Structure 1
Amino acid sequence: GSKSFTCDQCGKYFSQKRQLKSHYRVHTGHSLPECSHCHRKFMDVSQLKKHLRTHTGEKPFTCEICGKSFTAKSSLQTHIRIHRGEKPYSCSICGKCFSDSSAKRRHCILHTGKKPFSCPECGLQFARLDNLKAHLKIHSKEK
């Protein structure tokens, strides 16, 4: 089971050169599954079929409680926790709990105090990019 072919990008081992070339597509994108609409590339054909719904607006995962539909089954699973009051994600620092995992991750950054987004007009610094974008509307409306 010796493997002598290595990828110079991630270091993974392969027994045949043909296996290394097939893997190397993950770094170059060459010959990866390509969407016929936008020509962006994905790691396998299943991820491509998933992305295909972004062009059709199909939402095949419907909540049986409220009737709303979602593009991904994981999104429906996260949404169902709202109905059930299930908040398994908690900030270890202050104890605030969330049903949404990204809401928890986003909140925990506030304990660091980092504000890496600075308004190019007035210099006001924000912890989040979406709040900086909304702040810049104030300058556009001022003009």
Structure 2
Amino acid sequence: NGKLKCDVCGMVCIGPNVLMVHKRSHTGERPFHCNQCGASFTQKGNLLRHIKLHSGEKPFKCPFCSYACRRRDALTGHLRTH
């Protein structure tokens, strides 16, 4: 159970000390960092997209057939085929 959640990056922590200490790594330009590689971002959504690219890493997935494409416009063109 992790009851303390960060407002800025949304990470889960165990005790209030961990959260307080975590909050100072933010103070600065591009405060959102990735723990896996250290990539900094200016907004939280970009960091979430990055950390998602770390896992399954499938870029633009189709919601109707599950095929992945390298680009957004390629996925749009594919979606127009269903």
TM range (shorter): 0.3 to 0.5
With the length of structure 1 as denominator, give the TM-score of the two structures.
Answer: 0.27
| Max Rg structure | 1
Which structure would you say has the larger RCO, counting Cα contacts within 8 Å and 6 or more residues apart? 2
TM-score normalised by length of structure 2: 0.44
